[PDB]
Amino acid sequence: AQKFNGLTVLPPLLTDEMIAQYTSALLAGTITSGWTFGAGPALQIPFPMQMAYRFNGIGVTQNVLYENQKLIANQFNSAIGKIQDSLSSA
Amino acid sequence: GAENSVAYSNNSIAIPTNFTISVTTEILPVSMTKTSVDCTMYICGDSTE
Amino acid sequence: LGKLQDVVNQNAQALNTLVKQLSSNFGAISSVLNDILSRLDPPEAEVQIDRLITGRLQSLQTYVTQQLIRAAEIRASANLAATKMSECVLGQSKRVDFCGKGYHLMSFPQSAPHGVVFLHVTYVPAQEKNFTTAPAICHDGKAHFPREGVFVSNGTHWFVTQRNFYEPQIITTDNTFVSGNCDVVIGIVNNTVYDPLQPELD
Amino acid sequence: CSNLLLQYGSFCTQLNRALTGIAVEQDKNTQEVFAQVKQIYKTPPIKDF
């Protein structure tokens, strides 16, 4: 170790469990409320409506998501699989 | 924080019906005191050596 | 105020430590350089003088390094404050959670000693109501989608209201657009559209 | 060794204060990133998104 010569290491205030809890809370807020919880009280919304809401922010009309919702969901799942596989391969 | 759960459903939405105008204070320092230090008055006193 | 007090207390304590450094001998036989000159000859007391010079140089170098790091931090904070002024004060910033918690409207800068404060004006909702929503409305096989609002229902009828306020309105053509057929959305509801041109042509 | 360290006790004061400030800044860095919300939102048991 590196502590035998008086070079003590201070433990962090927040453990990894608390950081994981914070990240999970942020994840739940961003899938169940979008951005309402980040600027006030959390408001319930369906995820397809939130995805169309994000689509409206980039100049694409919301009518295109619901026509090919399965395609976008499959693309999202494949991208999640791809990043999970790439991170396992530093 | 407060352990609370958000009711989620595929056909449930929450539309606010009222608002409150709030004011948030943010403190930001932009400057500090300007000091000048010279060796001849600090390191030396009144001695030429 | 915590941010404005640290930048003054740290500088004051650094100045106090600089003053305290002259009260130490740094391993010599005296602290003041006049005492060794008065009690010892300059040819012999040269090494004590040089040791005092090295100690004072080290203390001054450490003070200069600390002040440079503090000045870098102050420069970063001043850049942040300038960007905050130019965005939240000289206009309305679309960056969420940058000009305060909530939907920013404007900010009012105020003078502060060796600093600046911003009185942001946010927009947070207060009361909300649960509603049943549908992403599309099937009128005559043509799916209607809201232009800027969202379809809501109070249990019996349907309306369209904006995102951040509840303003119920009758489902009409002026705020909805058609796209494709009806059998494309996984979740749709049956309803009718006002079409306010029909009663006026009679 | 300790008796000659009183001639440089001020230096030890600056070093200890700098390390304490570094530690408290490291502690404050995590609070500014992850503690954005003060309410812990529970994941709903329904996974049909």
Ligand SMILES: *[C@@H]1O[C@H](CO)[C@@H](O[C@@H]2O[C@H](CO)[C@@H](O)[C@H](O)[C@H]2NC(C)=O)[C@H](O)[C@H]1NC(C)=O
């Ligand atoms: C929105 O919230 C504001 C703030 O509470 C409400 O204003 C209050 O209304 C009550 C009853 O009408 C008054 O007794 C208070 O004096 C009001 N307070 C202020 C600061 O004006 C307002 O009524 C709410 N609006 C709705 C539609 O519920």
Ligand SMILES: *[C@@H]1O[C@H](CO)[C@@H](O[C@@H]2O[C@H](CO)[C@@H](O)[C@H](O)[C@H]2NC(C)=O)[C@H](O)[C@H]1NC(C)=O
């Ligand atoms: C849901 O909204 C509808 C539309 O506003 C309500 O129906 C109206 O209710 C008012 C209130 O008494 C009546 O004066 C109108 O004659 C109603 N119109 C129709 C077409 O029925 C309805 O009451 C609301 N329901 C709830 C539970 O709030």
Ligand SMILES: *[C@@H]1O[C@H](CO)[C@@H](O[C@@H]2O[C@H](CO)[C@@H](O)[C@H](O)[C@H]2NC(C)=O)[C@H](O)[C@H]1NC(C)=O
């Ligand atoms: C919404 O409307 C559509 C069409 O008006 C309904 O679809 C019809 O359903 C009946 C029996 O459920 C069938 O006999 C028809 O052939 C269907 N027509 C079409 C064009 O699909 C649908 O059932 C309605 N949904 C609800 C919940 O009432």
Ligand SMILES: *[C@@H]1O[C@H](CO)[C@@H](O)[C@H](O)[C@H]1NC(C)=O
């Ligand atoms: C709306 O109703 C649901 C259950 O029907 C409940 O979980 C939710 O908290 C309610 N929302 C409000 C704002 O009362």
Ligand SMILES: *[C@@H]1O[C@H](CO)[C@@H](O)[C@H](O)[C@H]1NC(C)=O
């Ligand atoms: C919402 O999800 C429930 C549970 O899977 C399902 O029974 C219901 O049909 C869904 N409604 C819509 C509109 O998709």
